[PDB]
Amino acid sequence: MKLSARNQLAGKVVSIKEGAVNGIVVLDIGGGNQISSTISMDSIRELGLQVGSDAYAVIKATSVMIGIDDW
Amino acid sequence: MKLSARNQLAGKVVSIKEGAVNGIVVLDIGGGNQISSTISMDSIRELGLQVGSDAYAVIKATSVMIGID
Amino acid sequence: MKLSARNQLAGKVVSIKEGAVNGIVVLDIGGGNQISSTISMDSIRELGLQVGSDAYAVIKATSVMIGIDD
Amino acid sequence: MKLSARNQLAGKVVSIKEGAVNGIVVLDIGGGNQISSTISMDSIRELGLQVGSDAYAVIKATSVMIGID
Amino acid sequence: MKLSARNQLAGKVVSIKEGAVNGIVVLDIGGGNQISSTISMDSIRELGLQVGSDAYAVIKATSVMIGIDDWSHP
Amino acid sequence: MKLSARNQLAGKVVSIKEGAVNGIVVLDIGGGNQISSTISMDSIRELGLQVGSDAYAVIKATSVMIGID
Ligand code: MOO
Ligand code: MOO
Ligand code: MOO
Ligand code: MOO
Ligand code: MOO
Ligand code: MOO
Ligand code: MOO
Ligand code: MOO
């Protein structure tokens, strides 16, 4: 499906740390940036994510804050 | 402040659409990637954000989903 | 795209409240239940949402709280 | 308590997956729909949740995205 | 209703800024602390919120991050 | 970094429950109030959090709901 989430960034799985009900997936999205995602193990398995998979980090605009260097 | 948010991505403001109590800030983070942020107008003002300002897109890991084709 | 969001609930748009930068879409998901979604106006336009449109409410499991009668 | 969260959907617990600090509660809300909720084990215990418990899925409007085919 | 949100903080409304579809409510929770809440106008009206109302800031634990001073070297 | 998060509440760590990939940090922020935070174990470690550490509970305004009696 097509989603309203304003942030949908293509990337490659670099690591998967499995937990009890959740795991943490790291995505290399290019330009030297990586995105860490804390999601359910159910989705990590069901999506077939493993190191090297093509995927997207998907983030709703209301979940994204803005910060600055306070110099 | 140093924050627990796993995602702290440097970038430049490319647009700011102001709203009533919130506004939407778009940040170019490089590599052809842009991040859209919906935050309070009060914070857009207090941080002095305008097109061209340096900033960071800050995202908690528990807020990030994974997608595939 | 297939998403990790554990909750993907089919529904019918019943109303759309346009705001300044955000809007609120109400989805009838059947059985007398509706889901309200506060999203960007840009997304409402890009997806072509209108009253009567078929859509899905998408919710990450970590965004869902549980309640009970006390 | 009466909460501002616009989404409050009654349901029946169909499973509870206990984890280390969190667990996952699956609620059948009727009509073939289920809601999965990832919450703290402390709250799962303090709410007395069990399979078969009556409960509610509570979701802030700002946490709900819209999708289309 | 009884909720799983780990954070349920009693306070009194000190201000309400109305927007187009959302508004921002500020709660004095004591100890010199205030909580800002961005929620729908529908809920601000439906809950009868006005300056002086008793209320709660309700926050899921998974929404709360931890910060420390920059001059801390873990 | 200075953050758009409208809520930045100073407090002291009163408990740490370590989990598998997340943990739960509780902060005493004064006035008889405590704030619970579910964050990644990586961040609990990198920030050096232990009982008694000075910290801030950081919360975006759009994550805060309102309740009443
Ligand atoms: O208890 Mo966990 O570390 O969220 O799987
Ligand atoms: O450690 Mo976090 O604050 O869940 O990204
Ligand atoms: O368009 Mo709004 O009411 O400022 O979020
Ligand atoms: O689904 Mo949105 O438009 O990123 O809040
Ligand atoms: O945290 Mo999920 O498994 O993307 O709903
Ligand atoms: O508490 Mo709301 O009005 O669902 O964002
Ligand atoms: O994730 Mo909780 O236990 O509803 O705050
Ligand atoms: O939505 Mo905010 O202004 O980053 O708390």
Numbering used by the authors:
A (entry chain E): 1 to 71
B (entry chain C), D (entry chain D), F (entry chain B): 1 to 69
C (entry chain F): 1 to 70
E (entry chain A): 1 to 74
Task: Quote what the paper states about this structure.
Here, we characterized E. limosum Tub, a tungsten storage protein. Tub has a sub-nanomolar affinity for tungstate and contains a single TOBE domain first characterized in a molybdate storage protein. Crystal structures revealed Tub assembles as a hexamer composed of a trimer of dimers, capable of binding eight tungstate oxyanions at two distinct binding sites located at inter-subunit interfaces. Tub enables E. limosum to accumulate W and then supplies W for two tungstoenzymes needed for conversion of lactate to SCFAs.
Isothermal titration calorimetry (ITC) analysis revealed that Tub contains two different binding sites for tungstate. Their individual binding properties could not be determined and the estimated Ka value was 1.00 pM with a saturating molar ratio of W to Tub of 1.44 ± 0.04:1. rTub was resistant to trypsin digestion both with and without added tungstate but was converted to the trypsin-sensitive monomeric form by TCA treatment. Similarly, Mo-loaded Tub exhibited the same thermal stability as the W-loaded form and was also resistant to trypsin digestion. In all crystal structures, three copies of the Tub dimer are arranged around a non-crystallographic threefold axis to form a spherical hexamer of 32 symmetry of 45 Å in diameter.
